[PDB]
Amino acid sequence: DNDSAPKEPTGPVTLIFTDIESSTALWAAHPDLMPDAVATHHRLIRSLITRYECYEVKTVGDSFMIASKSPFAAVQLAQELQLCFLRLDWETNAVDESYREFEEQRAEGECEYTPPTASLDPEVYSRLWNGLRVRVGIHTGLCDIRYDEVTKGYDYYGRTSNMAARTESVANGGQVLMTHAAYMSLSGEDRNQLDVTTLGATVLRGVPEPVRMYQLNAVPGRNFAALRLDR
Amino acid sequence: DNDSAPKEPTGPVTLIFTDIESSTALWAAHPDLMPDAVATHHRLIRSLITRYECYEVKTVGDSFMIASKSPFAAVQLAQELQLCFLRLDWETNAVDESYREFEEQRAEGECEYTPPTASLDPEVYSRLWNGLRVRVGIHTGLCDIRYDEVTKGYDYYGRTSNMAARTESVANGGQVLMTHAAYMSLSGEDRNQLDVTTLGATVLRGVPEPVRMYQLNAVPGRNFAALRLDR
Ligand SMILES: [Mg+2]
Ligand SMILES: [Mg+2]
């Protein structure tokens, strides 16, 4: 179960961090829907991990940490993740109703913030949003690779892992962010097969210099709030 | 792996959407049976796709999206799907017990709804129901065909694809629905080789006018609940 894990300290690793947007609030509002929805979320993501020969490093709550020996496979996985979650019949509209409510609640209490999906017409909304919203951050770089003798698993520490994590932290639900390093790790040909939007320099907590962010338009037409920067 | 994919924008495409009825609830009730049952489900469906020269567009959870250059091949596939799933020894009666429980749970809490299979005598039930219940929707029409350079795959977008998807969404487990367009895409001779029941005009979400629905009686004798319309 470790053949897909990047094992060479000299080989750059592409890390993908994911998290379910507003899962805490969803758990509170839908204790009856979340166990199943999250279980589905895990199954979908694990199928993608296998399909793109990536490696599941760990799961923390509903967050996934995935490693890939290939920058492109990581990007494909992230794109397919958004599409798969959008296309799946979640058997409930309650999650979407809650997401729209959260935007509305946030809008009234924050000046300079507008709901990115709650203002869409019903039919338009369902063509772009459906079910759990997963934020995804992707970064590529050399990592300090650690092997666990007891689990036979591999973990990745260092600034590279922290960079991937903070990139995910600023992404909104349904958004896929790639750092300049990840984006440029892809070959020129690979980049041209993708629909990407430059977001520009972004300030990440604990990172000295601004990081140029690239939005992978996995579900063309989606709008997002400003990045979840600290203050 | 794309020769069976409809590739001409002027050529009508027949799309088949499938999904496992109550898979979420089954996963919750049988985490020990579902991985294998779903794996079997995928193998059976993929054998049929190959047998009827159809094309697997994509898989979303346990849902299949299949395209066919031939309306009749699509209908044969759907009919054989129901029969194959019925005849297979799933090596468990747990799935059927759960399906019967779900009907009973739904009956007590809904006025005007009666269990379509939980009231069958044991021997009668097993002649008509066994294992995973797959809902199937079929529609024929011109599609916006998209080619993917990276996967070499073909996808189908537009109202035609959405129509096929919504047709599947209203079908019950073990039921095969064909829109008037799909049904009439078959030759007169082909239609006479089939056992079909007219269900009449049906309201589909996001569709302006009612759609006449036709039930392909793949397993004669089955009863179904009212169509899964929205409210
Ligand atoms: Mg979380
Ligand atoms: Mg499903």
Swiss-Prot record, chains A, B:
Residues 14-168 form the Guanylate cyclase domain. It is found in: Membrane. Residues 1-231 are cytoplasmic. Mg(2+) binds at residues 19, 62. Could act as a receptor for an unknown ligand. Belongs to the adenylyl cyclase class-3 family. This is Receptor-type adenylate cyclase GRESAG 4.3. It comes from Trypanosoma brucei brucei.
